[PDB]
Design a protein around this ligand. Structure first.
Ligand SMILES: *[B]([O])([O])C1=[C]C(C([C])([C])[C])=[C]C(C([C])([C])[C])=[C]1
Length: 352
């Protein structure tokens, strides 16, 4: 670890941890391809367990990047197309508002205002169908972006249907295993529980609760080493030996819609680099989108990123392919997103 990387990381993260009262944190910087790791504080305060490079954190919505890449892999295999109607994979979805809503719309939050959350009351498969049947779109498809778990969650579930595999099995065999993410889990096995950090919300130890379409939208747990490898894989997809996965990664970084300075991929979100740091709180934010017709293939000169939160955890991943540079920040408190971005930008800008 170069003293430069050490100094920029410690001078940025130490005050962040102090200001935000973060109990435990792990950081990976990917610099010229190699990962450098840093850890602070506690995975479990009461049991005095430290954060290590083996600690599991809830990724929250950073899981959407795995879903987007799994869907990209299914497209590359010829199993699905983003131009396919939703009803091709869910014919039971007969209500008329679904005519015109494609897998692209689901993946990119542009279906017309699918709800932010699947209600907790939805517990059965028939509950799920009722929910989507009864939903009344606010808008025509492809006109506004409304970030939503019920949108990308449904995309993940449908994308794996032609494979015959469960979502989890598909993710494991097609993404986690080939990339050697061997400590990344949709369900944490009993053998690995010793490494699962607690999250902290108002000083209480918490873990994310089960919900419909959780795995697809917010349910992955991972370590800082596996997350560094995920960043490496998304920085340099051509190093990946599995052809459809390499292609899937590229598809997830394609630019499908534009809102302001941001471009929506599959899971990933992107801005042109160099990026105004202030250009990189609100519970619900509807924004008109412009279609990118046709989508732009992955731009190397991009700030590519994704925030994640659960009740107890705050995560952030950002990378710049043209500079072979990236960062992962995993914490067991959900602290404000602007603090994540400011920290990540301070670190990557200094190393770029
Ligand atoms: B994700 O970590 O950004 C994410 C988003 C949401 C919205 C869509 C904002 C309600 C909800 C969650 C959970 C369900 C984990 C709180 C996560």
């Amino acid at each position: 670890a170069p003293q430069q990387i050490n100094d920029i990381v410690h001078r940025t993260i130490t005050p962040l941890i102090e200001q935000q009262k973060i109990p435990g944190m792990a950081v990976a910087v990917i610099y010229q391809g190699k990962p450098y790791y840093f850890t602070w504080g506690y995975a479990d305060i009461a049991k005095k367990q430290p954060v290590t490079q083996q600690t599991l954190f809830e990724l929250g919505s950073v899981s959407k990047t795995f879903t987007g890449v799994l869907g990209g892999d299914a497209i590359a295999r010829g199993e699905i197309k983003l131009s396919d109607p939703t009803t091709k994979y869910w014919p039971e979805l007969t209500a008329k508002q679904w005519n015109g809503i494609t897998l692209l719309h689901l993946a990119t939050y542009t279906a017309g205002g699918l709800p932010l959350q699947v209600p907790d009351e939805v517990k059965s498969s028939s509950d799920l169908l009722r929910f989507y049947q009864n939903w009344q779109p606010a808008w025509a498809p492809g006109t506004q972006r409304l970030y939503a778990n019920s949108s990308i969650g449904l995309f993940g579930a449908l994308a794996v249907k032609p494979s015959g595999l469960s979502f989890e099995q598909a993710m494991q065999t097609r993404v986690f295993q080939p990339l050697k993410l061997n400590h990344t889990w949709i369900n944490v096995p009993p053998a690995e529980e010793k490494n699962y950090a607690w999250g902290y919300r108002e000083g209480k130890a918490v873990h994310v609760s089960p919900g419909a379409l959780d795995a697809e939208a917010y349910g992955v747990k991972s370590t800082i080493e596996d997350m560094a490898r995920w960043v490496q894989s998304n920085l340099k997809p051509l190093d990946i030996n599995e052809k459809t996965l390499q292609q899937g990664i590229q598809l997830a970084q394609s630019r499908y819609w534009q809102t302001g300075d941001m471009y929506q991929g599959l899971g990933w979100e992107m801005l042109d680099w160099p990026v105004n740091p202030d250009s990189i709180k609100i519970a619900l934010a509807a924004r008109p989108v412009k279609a990118i017709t046709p989508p732009t293939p992955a731009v190397r000169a991009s700030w590519v990123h994704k925030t994640g939160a659960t009740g107890g955890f705050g995560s952030y991943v950002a990378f710049i392919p043209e500079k072979e540079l990236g960062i992962v920040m995993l914490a067991n408190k959900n602290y404000p997103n602007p603090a994540r971005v400011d920290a990540a930008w301070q670190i990557l800008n200094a190393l770029q």
